Design an enzyme around this catalytic site. Structure first.
Site, PDB file in Angstrom:
ATOM      1  N   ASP D 146       0.838  -1.188   0.000  1.00  0.00           N
ATOM      2  CA  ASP D 146       0.000   0.000   0.000  1.00  0.00           C
ATOM      3  C   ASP D 146       0.881   1.248   0.000  1.00  0.00           C
ATOM      4  OD1 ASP D 146      -1.932   2.133   0.824  1.00  0.00           O
ATOM      5  OD2 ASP D 146      -3.254   0.481   1.430  1.00  0.00           O
ATOM      6  N   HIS D 219      -9.942  -1.144  -7.749  1.00  0.00           N
ATOM      7  CA  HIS D 219      -9.560   0.029  -6.975  1.00  0.00           C
ATOM      8  C   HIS D 219      -8.608   0.909  -7.782  1.00  0.00           C
ATOM      9  CE1 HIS D 219      -8.641   2.595  -3.545  1.00  0.00           C
ATOM     10  NE2 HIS D 219      -7.379   2.219  -3.598  1.00  0.00           N
TER      11      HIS D 219
HETATM   12  C1  HEM Z   1     -10.219   0.992   2.208  1.00  0.00           C
HETATM   13  C2  HEM Z   1      -9.047   1.613   2.317  1.00  0.00           C
HETATM   14  C3  HEM Z   1      -8.077   1.559   1.205  1.00  0.00           C
HETATM   15  C4  HEM Z   1      -7.194   0.554   0.922  1.00  0.00           C
HETATM   16  C5  HEM Z   1      -7.007  -0.738   1.685  1.00  0.00           C
HETATM   17  C6  HEM Z   1      -6.476   0.954  -0.239  1.00  0.00           C
HETATM   18  C7  HEM Z   1      -5.488   0.136  -0.798  1.00  0.00           C
HETATM   19  C8  HEM Z   1      -4.794   0.472  -1.941  1.00  0.00           C
HETATM   20  C9  HEM Z   1      -3.844  -0.352  -2.587  1.00  0.00           C
HETATM   21  C10 HEM Z   1      -3.419  -1.733  -2.145  1.00  0.00           C
HETATM   22  C11 HEM Z   1      -3.386   0.331  -3.671  1.00  0.00           C
HETATM   23  C12 HEM Z   1      -2.353  -0.147  -4.664  1.00  0.00           C
HETATM   24  C13 HEM Z   1      -0.936   0.185  -4.178  1.00  0.00           C
HETATM   25  C14 HEM Z   1      -0.677   1.670  -4.245  1.00  0.00           C
HETATM   26  O1  HEM Z   1      -0.402   2.218  -5.335  1.00  0.00           O
HETATM   27  O2  HEM Z   1      -0.742   2.365  -3.207  1.00  0.00           O
HETATM   28  C15 HEM Z   1      -4.049   1.578  -3.701  1.00  0.00           C
HETATM   29  C16 HEM Z   1      -3.842   2.537  -4.663  1.00  0.00           C
HETATM   30  C17 HEM Z   1      -4.446   3.784  -4.594  1.00  0.00           C
HETATM   31  N1  HEM Z   1      -5.392   4.208  -3.730  1.00  0.00           N
HETATM   32 FE1  HEM Z   1      -6.151   3.189  -2.336  1.00  0.00          FE
HETATM   33  N2  HEM Z   1      -6.903   2.159  -0.661  1.00  0.00           N
HETATM   34  C18 HEM Z   1      -7.870   2.598   0.167  1.00  0.00           C
HETATM   35  C19 HEM Z   1      -8.606   3.785   0.132  1.00  0.00           C
HETATM   36  C20 HEM Z   1      -8.354   4.802  -0.778  1.00  0.00           C
HETATM   37  C21 HEM Z   1      -9.088   5.997  -0.898  1.00  0.00           C
HETATM   38  C22 HEM Z   1     -10.278   6.380  -0.046  1.00  0.00           C
HETATM   39  C23 HEM Z   1      -8.502   6.734  -1.928  1.00  0.00           C
HETATM   40  C24 HEM Z   1      -8.889   8.060  -2.469  1.00  0.00           C
HETATM   41  C25 HEM Z   1      -9.431   9.034  -1.744  1.00  0.00           C
HETATM   42  C26 HEM Z   1      -7.415   5.955  -2.425  1.00  0.00           C
HETATM   43  C27 HEM Z   1      -6.582   6.346  -3.446  1.00  0.00           C
HETATM   44  C28 HEM Z   1      -5.664   5.485  -4.050  1.00  0.00           C
HETATM   45  C29 HEM Z   1      -4.845   5.914  -5.196  1.00  0.00           C
HETATM   46  C30 HEM Z   1      -4.857   7.271  -5.858  1.00  0.00           C
HETATM   47  C31 HEM Z   1      -4.086   4.854  -5.534  1.00  0.00           C
HETATM   48  C32 HEM Z   1      -3.073   4.770  -6.653  1.00  0.00           C
HETATM   49  C33 HEM Z   1      -3.741   4.158  -7.891  1.00  0.00           C
HETATM   50  C34 HEM Z   1      -2.820   4.185  -9.088  1.00  0.00           C
HETATM   51  O3  HEM Z   1      -2.605   5.242  -9.722  1.00  0.00           O
HETATM   52  O4  HEM Z   1      -2.269   3.131  -9.460  1.00  0.00           O
HETATM   53  N3  HEM Z   1      -7.355   4.785  -1.715  1.00  0.00           N
HETATM   54  N4  HEM Z   1      -4.922   1.648  -2.637  1.00  0.00           N
END
Ligand code: HEM
Ligand code: HEM
Ligand code: HEM
Ligand code: HEM
Lengths: 306, 306, 305, 306, 307, 306
Positions: D146, D219
Site C-alpha cells: 500500500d 480500486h
Molecule cells: C479501504 C481503504 C483503502 C485501501 C485498503 C487501499 C489500498 C490500496 C492499494 C493496495 C493500492 C495499490 C498500491 C498503491 O499504489 O498504493 C491503492 C492505490 C491507490 N489508492 Fe487506495 N486504498 C484505500 C482507500 C483509498 C481511498 C479512499 C482513496 C482516495 C481518496 C485511495 C486512493 C488510491 C490511489 C490514488 C491509488 C493509486 C492508484 C494508481 O494510480 O495506481 N485509496 N490503494
C-alpha cells in the site's frame, strides 16, 4: 556558486576538535594542506560510505589570516574579544587553525586527524585537542538535552552563511569555540527544579518553561536575542560532551557558527556582562570557560583554489 | 523541468548489470517494457522502504535507438569505438539495451530483473549478466578503494547530465560499460608499494600519492584530464566487483556516466593508446576487458511518454 | 568434542563449493583441512561484531579412503541414486564440500578465495553457487523455507553424531542437491494450487490442516515418524540462487542429519513415492542437477591432522 | 520562500492520528498551542536526533477556521462532502484539529501527543485516536502493498503543495482522513486471484495488472484519474494499518494529501458513486468508512506567527 | 556453581580502562563499592538493554588483596614481575584496582566510570585512564587485525577460568595490563612486507604467514607457546587502540586474561628476554610499555558475598 | 530435561497481552489450539529471522485447568487472591488463557495474535487486550527505568522455573498479571526528589538510593523480600507501558514470572496490606489495578503432547 563547507551539517555521535598555532616559517606547509584538506576528507570518508558521515570544517583565525593571505579580509574577522565581567570571565586563548572533525565513528575522525597533523608536523604547535562523544539522548554533562533550538533548513542557512553583506567571502561562516569545564559537585547540589530554573527547560522531557516561570537569568532567556527589526538572531551549535573520570573533568566543548561574529558576541555579552534584569547567566556559576577562540571558515572553493 | 533517471544516485552494496540485444520483431515488446520500467521499479522497490534504495537505469544503444524511435537522435550516440592499442585492446561487443540495477540487497535487484526479463522473454537475447557485490570498505578486486574521486552535488550534475547543448535530450546521460577480468596472481606478485605506483594512491589509507612521487603511467595520472577550459573533465563511476572462485574470475564491472561520450572516450584513449609520457595504463597489465558497449540513458519522462 | 558450525542459523549470504581431489592432491588437501579453521578466523575476525562468517567442511566417502587411514564414519557412503518412475535423483562427483555462510557475500568470497588459492592445482571445481536471502526467508517458489527446522536441544540430537559412533562424535552428514525450478509452469498455478503442492499457506506460512493437506504435498511426504512415536528431523540451510539470463531459478538444498538414513528416507518418499502418493508434487516443478553426500567431522578432527 | 510542514515526508513504521473538536471558549488555548506545536515537535524529537524521524502535521477544518482566524480563507477549504451512494456511504464525522504524528518509534509519537493533549486539556474533545503500525513489507490489512504509486520528488511537490493559485496560503496542503474497518472474514473468502481483480495489482509481487485484464471496477482503475490537460491527478497517501484482534478490528487509516481537495473528492465520487462502466469500487465491498474529515494543513510559518 | 565476571565476553567498539591505588584508610570504602559494583553496572546498563552490551570486570592486585581480605589468597596472585631485558624492559607500575569497562557506546562506559569513581573519591588515587576505540576492521595502531587467534567457546573457558586447581577461587581469572606507545614514524618507514615480518601475518588479509617464511623473532612466533603436553598455551586478549593526535600518542592498551599468570608471563619472557633463536620480539622495536600490572578478577559471587 | 516456554527470554520493544475466557463447550477447540501454538509461533516468526525475536507464552488459569485437563494439577495453581487493604485494593478479574506475545516489531505480535484468535473464534470471549511499547531508555509511564533488578542467567532459572518440588510440571512457571492505570496529574505534582522517595531509586540515573535514605514504604523496600536461608526471593518482570492519550490512559501492564506464586503473593500482600513499618506501597497512591489474574505456563512439551 560559492560552495560552503559542511557548516550546516547535523550533530554526530563522535567529534574531534583540533586547535593549532602556526610556527614561524610554517605558512607554506599550511597553505599546501589547506588545498588538500577536502581531498584528505574524501580519501578517508569514502571508505565508510554511506553511514560514516565524515566531515571536516577548517577555520582560520584573525592573525593567522594576515600571515597566510594577502588582499581583502572577511569583514568581521578579529581575535576573540575577552569579556571581563564582575563575576565570570571569558578568556581568549591562542589558536590559528581550527579543525572541526565529525563522524558517526571515532576511528574516522582519528584517521583524518592523523592525516592532517601528519602533513602539518613541524609547522604547527597543538594548542587543544578534544575527543567528543554523544551522551545518551543528546544530553550534555549537566544532564540536559543540548541543541534543541538549532535552526534548520532555510533559517539555518540564513543565520550561518555570509551573503551579500560581504560578497567576496559569501558562503563562509564564523566559528566561536570555548572549552567549558563544569563543577558537577555544585551542580548536583541543586534540586532538579532548581537546575531547570538555571537552564529554562524541563530536564527529562526537554520542554521549554512557560514565559511566566522562566527566570530572566536563565540560560534560554539570556541567549534569546531579537534584532531591531524584530527578527530572532540565531546561531548553529554543535556542542559535544567530553571528559576524564580520574581527573574529575566533565566538560562541554562549545562551538557556534553564525554569519557574523556580532550575533555570537551579543549572546556572550549577555551571558558574561549580564543585562539590566540579570547580573549574569546562572549556567556560568557551574561552568568555566578555559579556552576562547574565533575563526573564519571560508567557502570550500576558497581553500581549493589556493 | 526534465526528470533524470537515478544516474546521480550513489553506490550501493549490490548490483545487477544486464545487457541484451533485441531479436527480430522485438521492437514493440521492448517499447512496452520501456514505458513500464519505472512502475516495475516501484512495484518491487516500495516493498523495502526505506532502506532498499532500489533503482534501475535503462540505456539504449546507437543501433537500437533507430529501430525503436523515429525523429531526433542524441547528439553523442554512436557504437562503442574499439581501440586496438600496441599491447592492450578495448574490445567492442553487442549490446542493445542496458539495465543497471542497484539496491542495498541483491534480492530486490534479482526480483526487478526477473520482472524485466519476464516481459522481454522471446524478444531479446541475453549478452551479459553480472551480479556485483560490495567488497569490504568500498574496495575492488585489486584491493584498492574504488570511487573516491567521483564528483558529488553540483559538480556531479554538471558532469553527468545532458544540458542546453542538446535540449531535446536534456536530463539524459551516456553510459560506457566494460567487463574487466583481473590477473590476481601477477598482481599479488607485486609488492604493495609497487601496486601503489600502478594506481597512484596508497593501498590501505586511500590517500593520493604526492605529485612528486606519482608516476605518469599511474592510473590516476592517465585518467586525470583537463579541457581547453582548464577545468577537470569528470565522469561518475559505479564500478562493482564480481567473480567466481572456481573459474578464477576476479572482475571489475566498469560503468561510467558522462554528459558526452567524448569525455569517457578520451580517458579510454589515454589508457589503451597512451600519451607522450606513458605507453599505456599500468592497470591494463593486470586487467583485460572482455566486453565494451555504449548506451544513452534517457530522462525518466522520455521513457514514460511512449 | 567441538563440532563445526553445523548448528548455525541461516544467513543472508552463502557460497557452496564442491570440488574433486585430483590424483596426487591428497597431501595439499590434508594441509588445507588442518588450516581451514584459522583461515576462517583470519577473514571473519575482520567483521567480528556481526559478520557471522562460518565454514563447514565436508568429506566424501571415496575421498575419505584416499585421505585417511583407519576408522570410517559408519553411515558414510556415496550418494545413492534414485531412479523413480518419473523423476530421478542423480548422483554427481564431489569429494569436498565447503559450506560458507556470512551476513555479507564479501566475507564468503574472501574465505573461498583463500581456500581455493591453497587448493589450486590439487582440486577440480565441480559446482559453485552464490546463495542470497530472498525477502522474508523465501525460496524461488515464493514460500517461506526452513520454518520447521529443529531448534535448541532437539536440533542437537537430530544433527550431531553421538554415542552410536563415538570415534566421530560431534560430526554430521550433509546431503547436497542443486535444484532448478520451472518458474513458467509454477507461475501458471493459482496460489491455492501452489499451497496444495507445498502443504502450507503461501503468504502467512501457516501449515494446512490435516483435513485438507494432500498426501502428495511436500510437507506430507517429508514428514516422517520413525519406528517409535518420534518424528525424524533434519536441519536445512537451503539458499535461493539463480541467473535471470540463463533462466536459472534454483534452490540449493543442503540438509544436515546425525545419520544419512533419515535424509535418504525422505528422499525415497519424494522420488519413489509411498502408498497414496506417486511422488512429491514439488518435483513436477523442480529438477535435481547435482547429488552428493558428505561427512562433516568434528572441528578437532580437522585440527589434529 | 514559504516553509511547509512535513507533508512530503515518507511513510514511517509508527504513527498516531489524533482528531479533536474545539469546545466553546477553547479558541484561545488552541491558538496558543498552534503557535508552540513546532517547538514541542523539536523538544521531543531532538532527543532521538538520528533515526527518530519525529514529525507532526497539524490540520484545521473549515468550521474551525472561521471560529479561530479572522481573515482570508484557503480557497479549497470546506467541510467533508458526505457521499450517499446506492450501496456504500461515505460518512462525514466531526473534526476541528488533525494531528498527524509520525516517527520510527511509537514512544516518540506518544510523548509528543501527550504534550499536545496536555496543553489542550479542557479546551478540546477527542473524537478519534488511532495507533498505526507498519505491517510486514509495507502491507495493509488486505495483504497488499500500500502506497506504491505515491508521487516522489518534484511530482510530489506539484501535486501536494498549494502554489500561486492561492498565494496567501502557499506551502499549505489539504488532508482528507477516513478510518476504514475491513471485513476480513469476507475478504479471506475470495481466492488470491479474485482479490487481485478487486485491487488491480498482483498480491505477492505488487506488480500492476495489464490494462487488458484489469477490471473497470478495480480500486486501481477508479483511483486512476486524468485531468483536462491529459496528465494524471495524483495524491500523497500515508495510510497506516491499525486494529485490535479481540474485537475483530482490522483497519486502514486513510490519509491523503493534495494541493486541492477536488482531486481527492473526484476519486471519492468514483469509488462511492461509480462511473459509466463501474457501479462502485469493489474495495468498499470489504471496507466500511466510519469517519470522514477534511483539513487544511498550513505552511509552518503560518502557525508560528500566531 | 560459581558465576564468573564478563571475562569471556567479546571485544566491543568502546572501552574504558581505569587503574587506581587504594589510599591509607580507604579499605572500607573500597570493600563497600566492590559489593555494589554489579548493581551499579545494571543501573546504567539496563537503560540500553538491547544492544548496549555494558560490562565491568573488576580486578584486585596482590598487595591490595592482603589489605582488603583476611582469608585465603588466589594461588597465582603476585605483583607484576619486571623484566629487564638487554634492550627492552617491561616496567611494573602501581595499581591496586582495575576496572575494565566495555560497551558498544562510550557514553555507557563513562556513565558507569563516573558512578564507580564518585563512590571511591577520597579512598583511591587514579594511576591510569584510557578511553579505547575500535579502529576500522578490528585493527590496531600498527594497522594489523588484532585479536584474530583469541580462543572461543569451550577452548576459551578452559584457558581463562580458574578451575579445580584452586577450587576456592573457581570462576576467577588473571588479568595482565600493559599500556604500549608506538613509534609510528619508524614503523611507517618499513615496507608492508617488512612490517609483515615483524608481526607474522599478512597486513590486509590477516592471513598467517607460512611456517617456512615466518621469522623466529616475529610477534606470532614468539607468542606461540606449547606446554609440556604439546597443546597450545592460550590467553584471551581485549586490546583496544587509543591515542592523542596532537601529542603524537598512538597506543595499544594490552589486556590478557588467563587461568594462571604463568602463561602470560612465559609469553612476556619470550618477548622481552628472547629465546635461543631470537634476541627479542621485533614488535618491541616500535612499542614501549609504560605501565605493567597484574590483577585477579574474582567470581561475581565473591564480590557480592562481601556485602 | 523438560523444555520451558520463553519465560526466561528478555524484554522486547513490542508486546501483545491477550486474556480470554473459554466459553461453555469451547474446550475441544482450545485443546487443539494449545497443541498448535508453537507451530503458529514458528509460522509467523521464521519470516523475520533473526531480528524478529517473536515469542509466545501461553498460560492457563486454575478453573480453566479443571475444564481442560484430567489428572494431576500444578501444586501452586489457584485463583488470584483479592487483596482488600485499608486503602488500596487488588481486584480479581476473569481470565482462563493468557497469551504473552513479544517481538521487536508489533506486526509480528499482531500477526500471531490474529492466527491464535482466528482458531479460537466462537470458543472464547476476550477479557483484555493490551498493546505494549518500549518508552525511551526502558522507562515506564512514571518516568523510571523499569526492570533493572530482574535476575539473569542461573539466578533467573532458579527463580522462575518449576523444579523438583513439583516434578510433573518441571520447566513450567507461574504468571501474575495486573493492568495498572496511573494518575499522571498527581504524580507530576510531586518533585523529582519526592518521586525518588516513592520508587526508591534515582530517576534519571536509575541508581538505587542508599539504605539510610530509602523509605520503608518505598516500592523497592516493600518488594525486597528475603527467604528462609537469607537469600532474596526474586521474580522476573516483563512490564510494558501502554496507553491512549485521548482517554487519559497511562498504564503499566505488570506481568511477573516465578516458580511459585507464594513469592509474587508475598510482595502483593506487602504492597496492598502493608507491614508494621509501612502502611502500604506509595506507588499505589498513583496506580490503580483494574485487572488481576494468575496463570500456570506449562513446559513447552506439555502443550504439544495434547
Ligand atoms: C479501504 C481503504 C483503502 C485501501 C485498503 C487501499 C489500498 C490500496 C492499494 C493496495 C493500492 C495499490 C498500491 C498503491 O499504489 O498504493 C491503492 C492505490 C491507490 N489508492 Fe487506495 N486504498 C484505500 C482507500 C483509498 C481511498 C479512499 C482513496 C482516495 C481518496 C485511495 C486512493 C488510491 C490511489 C490514488 C491509488 C493509486 C492508484 C494508481 O494510480 O495506481 N485509496 N490503494
Ligand atoms: C526442491 C527443493 C525444495 C524446496 C523448494 C523445498 C521447500 C520447502 C518448503 C517451502 C517447506 C515448508 C517450510 C519449511 O518448513 O521449511 C519445506 C519443508 C520441508 N522440506 Fe523441503 N524443499 C525442497 C527440497 C527438500 C528435500 C530434498 C528434502 C529432504 C531431503 C526436504 C525436506 C523438507 C522437510 C523435512 C521439511 C519440513 C516438513 C515438516 O516437518 O513440516 N526438502 N520445504
Ligand atoms: C605491543 C602491543 C601489541 C600489539 C600491537 C599486538 C598485536 C598483535 C597482532 C597483530 C597479533 C596477530 C593477530 C592476532 O592473532 O591477534 C597478535 C597476536 C598475539 N599476541 Fe600480540 N600484540 C601486542 C602485545 C602482546 C603481548 C604483550 C602479548 C602477551 C602478553 C601478546 C600476545 C599475543 C598472542 C598470544 C597472540 C596470538 C599468537 C598466535 O597463536 O597466533 N601480544 N598480537
Ligand atoms: C504499578 C505498577 C508498577 C510499576 C510502575 C513498577 C515500577 C518499578 C520500578 C521503577 C522498579 C525499580 C527498577 C527495577 O528494578 O525494575 C521496580 C522494582 C520492582 N518491582 Fe515494581 N512496579 C510495579 C508493580 C509491581 C508489582 C505488582 C510487583 C510485584 C508483585 C513488583 C515487583 C517489583 C520488584 C520485585 C522489583 C525489584 C525490587 C528490588 O529488588 O530492587 N512491581 N518496579
Amino acid at each position: 556558486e560559492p560552495e560552503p563547507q559542511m557548516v550546516l551539517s547535523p550533530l554526530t555521535s563522535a567529534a574531534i576538535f583540533l586547535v593549532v598555532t602556526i610556527d614561524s616559517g610554517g605558512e607554506d606547509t599550511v597553505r599546501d594542506l589547506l588545498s588538500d584538506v577536502a581531498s584528505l576528507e574524501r580519501a578517508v570518508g569514502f571508505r565508510a560510505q554511506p553511514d560514516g558521515r565524515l566531515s571536516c570544517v577548517t577555520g582560520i583565525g584573525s592573525e593567522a589570516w594576515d600571515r597566510l593571505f594577502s588582499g581583502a579580509r572577511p569583514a568581521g574577522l578579529h581575535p576573540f574579544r575577552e569579556l571581563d565581567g564582575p563575576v565570570h570571565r571569558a578568556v581568549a586563548t591562542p589558536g590559528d587553525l581550527l579543525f572541526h572533525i565529525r563522524a558517526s565513528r571515532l576511528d574516522l575522525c582519528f584517521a583524518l586527524a592523523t592525516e592532517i597533523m601528519g602533513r602539518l608536523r613541524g609547522a604547527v604547535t597543538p594548542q587543544d585537542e578534544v575527543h567528543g562523544f554523544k551522551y545518551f539522548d543528546e544530553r550534555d554533562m549537566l544532564g540536559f538535552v543540548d541543541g534543541t533550538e538549532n535552526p534548520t533548513g532555510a533559517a539555518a542557512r540564513r543565520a550561518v552563511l555570509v551573503g551579500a553583506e560581504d560578497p567576496a567571502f559569501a558562503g563562509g561562516s564564523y566559528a566561536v569555540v570555548q572549552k567549558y569545564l563544569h563543577d558537577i559537585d555544585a551542580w548536583e547540589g541543586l534540586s532538579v527544579e532548581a537546575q531547570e530554573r538555571v537552564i529554562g527547560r524541563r530536564k527529562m522531557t526537554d520542554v521549554e518553561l512557560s514565559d511566566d516561570v522562566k527566570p530572566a537569568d536563565s540560560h534560554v532567556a539570556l541567549t534569546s536575542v531579537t534584532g531591531p527589526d524584530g527578527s530572532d538572531l540565531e546561531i548553529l551549535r554543535d556542542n559535544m560532551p567530553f571528559g576524564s573520570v580520574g581527573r574529575e573533568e566533565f566538560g562541554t566543548y562549545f562551538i557556534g557558527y553564525a554569519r557574523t561574529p556580532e550575533v555570537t558576541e551579543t549572546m556572550l555579552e549577555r551571558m558574561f556582562l549580564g543585562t539590566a534584569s540579570a547580573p549574569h547567566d546562572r549556567i556560568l556559576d557551574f561552568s568555566t570557560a578555559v579556552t576562547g577562540s574565533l575563526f573564519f571558515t571560508p567557502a570550500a572553493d576558497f581553500l581549493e583554489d589556493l
